[model samples]
Target chain A: GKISTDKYIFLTPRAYIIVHLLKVGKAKASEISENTQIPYQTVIQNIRWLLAEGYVVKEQKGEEIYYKLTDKGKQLATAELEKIRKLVEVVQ
Target chain B: GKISTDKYIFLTPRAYIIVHLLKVGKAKASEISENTQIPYQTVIQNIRWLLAEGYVVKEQKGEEIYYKLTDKGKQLATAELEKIRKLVEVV
Candidate 1:
């Protein structure tokens, strides 16, 4: 079963996926790009939005930069998850 | 409190909302427009997509046209609902 991100109103699919991935832990651009198969440049582009919107912060992991969610970002993600949980039953 | 449709990949918020509403029962364009506050023309435009995509069919209730979900549409709505249910914990 594929979870398609078609009906969302706020973040695009790429941005949402990136945020969701980071919710587990911090990861570098390369790691996210490689894991999601969203292309390096594209991931960077979406990450820029997430960063600009104050959803994520950058950390120096050795010589590489990794992205971590801000409190605001975590809250946003949590709220979305809660919403979907409720909608699932409603739609069912 | 607001369930923002920002992360979905397949349908726009308007389109998804329309489908979800149709899942409950049939309604005229005016009915949907009033309930959702999405604007009449806007609702009609999205309904056109639903119609074209075969997610809904038109039924005439007297002289007015009402939209009803097809089996495919119901399945799609159900799947989306299920996905969100699982994601509630994951996200």
Candidate 2:
């Protein structure tokens, strides 16, 4: 359900979402799908890893299901996104 | 010599250099490594696939080896980068 690569996975595709959470704090697959690049369908699909891997957790507000990054996720996201941004700087 | 993922593999990391080659045409391992932040080692390793797969060809200029993307490489890189750019645009 999640996207990535290597000993890791497609870092930028996956990290695209990771950095999104870092910026917005928490959200759902739908919420995370808006105007942030990486395609909504792709984001939702990839977000599955964060849930399954414990990088993120699920919570409910009223009738809505929301996703938020785990403490583990935050730490990893910071480190991962840092590398991604660096990569993007030269290439993107 | 190279890195990636399953089914296909790490598209972004792999595509990073794909896009680079798209921009710069051909380059050496060292040239591909510089400026780009995926890490020089990472690009060099990934370049292995392009070489083995014939996406690029090796040519000697003086004492140095240079790599230039094949027509096949250009075509695939175009389509792949198109998807990546679209994905970047939408979500």
Q: Output the number of the DockQ-best candidate.
A: 1
Q: Please report, as a residue range, the 10-residue window in candidate 2 chain A with the lowest summed lDDT.
A: A1-10
Models 1 onward score TM values of 0.71, 0.52
Give the proportion of true interface contacts each model preserves, from 0 to 1: 0.17, 0.15
Isolated chain A TM-score, each model: 0.72, 0.70
What 10-residue stretch in candidate 1 chain B is worst by lDDT? Answer: B1-10
Candidate that would win on TM-score: 1
Candidate 1: stretches off by over 4 Å:
A1-15, A33-43, B1-12, B15-19, B39-41
What's the CA RMSD for each of the models? Answer: 5.8, 7.5
lDDT, candidates in the order shown: 0.62, 0.62
| Interface CA RMSD, all predictions | 8.3, 7.6
- Candidate 2 segments exceeding 4 Å error: A1-57, A60-92, B1-11
lDDT of 2 by residue, A1-92 (tens): 22223322234556556766766777777777674555776677667766766778889966787888898786775565454444444544
Residues B1-91, model 2: lDDT tens digits? 1222332222355666766776777677788778455567677777787777777777789998777788987776665444444433443
Task: Give the CAPRI class of candidate 2.
Answer: incorrect
